[PDB]
Amino acid sequence: GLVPRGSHMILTLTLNPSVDISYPLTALKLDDVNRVQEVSKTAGGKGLNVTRVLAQVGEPVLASGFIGGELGQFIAKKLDHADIKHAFYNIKGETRNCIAILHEGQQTEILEQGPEIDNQEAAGFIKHFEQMMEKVEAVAISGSLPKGLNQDYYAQIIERCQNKGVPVILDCSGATLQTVLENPYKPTVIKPNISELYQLLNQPLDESLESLKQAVSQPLFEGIEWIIVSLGAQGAFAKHNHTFYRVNIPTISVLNPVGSGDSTVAGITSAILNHENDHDLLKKANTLGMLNAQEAQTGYVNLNNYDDLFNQIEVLEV
Amino acid sequence: GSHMILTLTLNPSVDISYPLTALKLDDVNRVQEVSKTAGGKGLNVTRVLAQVGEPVLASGFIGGELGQFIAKKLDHADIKHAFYNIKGETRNCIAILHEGQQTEILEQGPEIDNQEAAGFIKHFEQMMEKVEAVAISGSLPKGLNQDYYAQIIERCQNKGVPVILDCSGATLQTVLENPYKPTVIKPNISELYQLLNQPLDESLESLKQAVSQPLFEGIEWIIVSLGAQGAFAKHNHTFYRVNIPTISVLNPVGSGDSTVAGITSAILNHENDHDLLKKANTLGMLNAQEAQTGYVNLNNYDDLFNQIEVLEV
Ligand SMILES: Nc1ncnc2c1ncn2[C@@H]1O[C@H](COP(=O)(O)OP(=O)(O)NP(=O)(O)O)[C@@H](O)[C@H]1O
Ligand SMILES: Nc1ncnc2c1ncn2[C@@H]1O[C@H](COP(=O)(O)OP(=O)(O)NP(=O)(O)O)[C@@H](O)[C@H]1O
Ligand SMILES: [Mg+2]
Ligand SMILES: [Mg+2]
């Protein structure tokens, strides 16, 4: 077996990674000292969840984005331990922490804004990204932009992809997604959940098929090949060019559905890399999402259970 | 030559401070203004010594990427260090400042194994010719034998290097029970009585009885700090009361560590009893006037030093 030298590889982007600290406490005593023994500290970020699931699936993958300081080094180390390749751009600022306190049935979180990217670093990353284009065949982009970047930064990145014929799978929300949709350079896939789809449309959430069809058909979403709307336990609703799919999925035992969309995005990206057909793509995406929801870990799948779930999924033209 | 202080922080931390308007439970709290510092009582002592212009070298255990954050912060302050690296990772600690409250999460931190413990002792010995005083602050990290400070102080005594010690509880108890004695201890009043399992009593007669117990045998200086009320001390057979003025206070945390920096400076320079006590309290006071922890403005030193009264009692 030779190490490959071509472009058969997925690039993931995590522009605002975090060192996530999880504090499980018997009780959170306010205005007091809380002593902890079993802290978990992890490499955090939506794009990193996508990366980890791709690595589990066995797809060739490279992680990039911005890292800074010792916390950036911590992230690199976590990826090294997992044998995941990375080529982050180094910044003068410091990678952020995020805190989760798990106490008394509650999850209390403190989320840091993170570093500011300066103009030289913003420009340097674009050049770094350009050079990576000849070695990759798909780009997955997850999460919002860190402070200091122009509003158009994802639009600029997608332009670089479009210029080299590289498909972009995009998973962002709110104004971040809105700015992309209005720009001429298009992602190949977007993956909102139904909540993200409607708040983007500034209209109320409607679970009906007819309303969904109209929603994804609006001129906001023109030029986008795949619109895959994930529906948690109800599966997915999707639009490919001019075709509508409804993706029905079996009921399973859920532990933590967080990162299931990231797991879906990994499935979509794996399927795009391999030029899979519509049914196989939608089934892989949902199988990975479901498998993650069955796990206590975030962005994690047990593939021993893959085939069992995959074969239960119904995809139909609606 | 060896005109230099060594500080020990066996248990450092990367301290994160989050000021929030409200701490919203079971919800997301967004912060933009975060302060992350190289934490530990011994590092407070170190910063204040550096500020006063004393030659100082910081040691202790560090590990992993958080260990390097600590080294880098000292480098930026131009503070010298000679830590010993461990397999484990230096810990974080969290303080959340919300609605007049201070909610803290303190990580237990890394376990120091047998190899590293023994390795550190050798490294420590190698530093005894380079220094003329040692300041030891804080509790032991996980995994160290209860006698570890006893072992350290033994090496100092072997080379006639005086030790200023600031720890509490069973840690201080263990040192006091061993033959190798520190030259100074600096409990606050609360710590003194907690150690003795006695009720807190601020009277001169009670303090004189407390510090003269057999447990404190063979300690040259027992300096009991009293916050805004100043200090009470025993030097050999002499008792001292240190009275101080009422000043504008912002944050007194780390004022004991500032006092310890003052004491150690005074010991290094062989200052007299009055000058040692006045310097110790001046630095404690200067710290209390600052929002930052373990920070002093020396432009205000003389004015406060000049107001301190030291009485033999
Ligand atoms: N409770 C559940 N039961 C079964 N399958 C689920 C469940 N939740 C999610 N899934 C699967 O995972 C897919 C994506 O989940 P979903 O919760 O819609 O993503 P998301 O909200 O974007 N989560 P995140 O990755 O944290 O952003 C779904 O379409 C399902 O196939
Ligand atoms: N509110 C205050 N006003 C004036 N001076 C103070 C005040 N608090 C502390 N000081 C000075 O600082 C010295 C030591 O403070 P103290 O609070 O006794 O230390 P501590 O309890 O060991 N604090 P820490 O360093 O955080 O452990 C006192 O003896 C005073 O000289
Ligand atoms: Mg999502
Ligand atoms: Mg103290």
Best of A112, A113, A147 to substitute, by most chain B Cβ atoms within 10 angstroms, is A112
> Helix A153-162 crosses helix A174-181 at what angle (to 10 degrees)?
40
DSSP string, B134-199: EEEESPPPTT--TTHHHHHHHHHHHTT--EEEE--HHHHHHHHHSSS--SEE--BHHHHHHHHT--
- Which of these, B97, B53, B100, lies nearest to B78 by C-alpha position? B53
Shortest-distance ligand to the CA of residue B259: 2
**CA B44/CA A156 separation, integer angstroms:** 47
* Residue B97 near residue B86 (C-beta atoms within 8 A): no
Q: Report the separation in Å between the CA atom of B249 and the middle of ligand 2, taken as the mean of its atom positions.
A: 10
Q: Which amino acid is at A303?
A: L
DSSP string, chain A: -PPP-SS--EEEEESS-EEEEEEEES---TTSEEEES--EEEEE-HHHHHHHHHHHHT--EEEEEEEEHHHHHHHHHHHHHTT-EE-PEEESS-PEEEEEEEETTEEEEEEE--PPP-HHHHHHHHHHHHHHGGG-SEEEEESPPPTTS-TTHHHHHHHHHHTTT--EEEE--HHHHHHHHTSSS--SEE--BHHHHHHHTTS-----HHHHHHHHHSGGGTT-SEEEEE-GGG-EEEEETTEEEEEE------S--TTHHHHHHHHHHHHHHTT--HHHHHHHHHHHHHHHHTSSSSS---GGGHHHHHTT-EEEE-
**CA B180/CA B153 separation, integer angstroms:** 6
Residue nearest to atom 8 of ligand 2 (CA): B227
Q: Which domains does chain B have, with CATH numbers?
A: 1-313 (3.40.1190.20)
Q: Report the separation in Å between the CA atom of A60 and the middle of ligand 1, taken as the mean of its atom positions.
A: 24
Task: Please work out whether the CB of residue A257 comes within 6 Å of at least one atom of ligand 1.
Answer: yes
Q: Which residues of A touch B25 (CB under 8 A)?
A: 28, 106, 108
Shortest-distance ligand to the CA of residue A174: 3
DSSP SS3 for B221: strand
Burial class (CB in 10 A: 0-12, 13-18, 19+), A251: exposed
Q: Which amino acid is at A218?
A: Q
**Token digits for A82?**
């997992």
State the sign of the Cα–Cα–Cα–Cα dihedral A254, A258, A264, A266. negative
**CA A179/CA A202 separation, integer angstroms:** 15
* Residue A109 near residue B29 (C-beta atoms within 8 A): yes
Is A152 annotated as catalytic? no
**CA B243/CA B309 separation, integer angstroms:** 5
**Token digits for B34?**
């975060």
CA distance A145 to chain B (A): 15
State the sign of the Cα–Cα–Cα–Cα dihedral A236, A239, A240, A242. positive
Q: Distance from CA of residue A3 to its chain's centroid?
A: 27
**CA A161/CA B193 separation, integer angstroms:** 70
DSSP SS3 for B101: strand
DSSP SS3 for B131: coil
- Which of these, B268, B273, B303, B267, lies nearest to B285 by C-alpha position? B303
Checking A236-240 for CB contacts under 8 A at 24+ apart, the result is A236/A264, A236/A282, A236/A285, A236/A286, A237/A194, A237/A209, A237/A212, A238/A282, A239/A213, A240/A278
Residue B74's alpha-carbon distances to B61, B82, B223, in angstroms, are: 14, 11, 29
Task: Please work out whether the CB of residue A290 comes within 6 Å of at least one atom of ligand 1.
Answer: yes
Q: Would you tell me how many other CB atoms lie within 10 Å of the CB of residue B106? A: 16
Q: Phi and psi at residue A278, in whole multiples of 5°? A: -55, -50
- Which of these, A299, A176, A192, A316, lies nearest to A247 by C-alpha position? A316
**CA A36/CA A41 separation, integer angstroms:** 13
Residue A197's alpha-carbon distances to A113, A221, A239, A287, B149, in angstroms, are: 25, 11, 13, 21, 62
Burial class (CB in 10 A: 0-12, 13-18, 19+), A41: middle
Q: Phi and psi at residue B150, in whole multiples of 5°? A: -55, -50
- Which of these, A15, A44, A6, A8, lies nearest to A125 by C-alpha position? A15
- Which of these, A69, A22, A66, A68, lies nearest to A48 by C-alpha position? A66
**A274: which residues sit within 8 A by CB, 6+ positions away?**
none
* Residue A84 near residue A14 (C-beta atoms within 8 A): no
- How far the first Cα of chain A sits from its last, in Å, is 45
**Token digits for B266?**
């005074």
B172-181 burial by CB neighbour count: b if 16+ within 10 A, else e? bebbbeeebb
**Token digits for B222?**
């027992």
Among the residues of chain B, which ranges form H helices?
41-52, 64-76, 114-125, 148-158, 169-177, 189-196, 204-211, 255-268, 273-288, 301-305
Q: Distance from CA of residue B23 to its chain's centroid?
A: 31
Resolution (A): 2.0
- Which of these, A32, A31, A15, lies nearest to A67 by C-alpha position? A15
User: A312 — contact with chain B (CB < 8 Å)?
Assistant: no
Q: Of the candidates A29, A37, A71, which has its C-beta nearest B108's C-beta?
A: A37
DSSP helix, strand, coil percent of chain B (3-state; round to 5): 35, 25, 35
Under DSSP, the state recorded for B91 is E
- Which of these, B55, B6, B19, B60, lies nearest to B38 by C-alpha position? B60
**A135: which residues sit within 8 A by CB, 6+ positions away?**
A6, A7, A9, A62
* Residue A176 near residue A145 (C-beta atoms within 8 A): yes
User: Facing residues of B223 across strands?
Assistant: B233
* Residue B57 near residue B153 (C-beta atoms within 8 A): no
**CA A162/CA A90 separation, integer angstroms:** 25
CB contact under 8 A, B92 and A31: no
- Which of these, B230, B189, B227, B226, lies nearest to B211 by C-alpha position? B189
Within the 132-151 window of chain A, which residues sit less than 8 Å (CB to CB) from chain B? none
Shortest-distance ligand to the CA of residue B242: 2
* Residue B88 near residue B141 (C-beta atoms within 8 A): no
**CA A18/CA B175 separation, integer angstroms:** 42
Q: Which residues of B touch A18 (CB under 8 A)?
A: none
CB contact under 8 A, B26 and A69: no
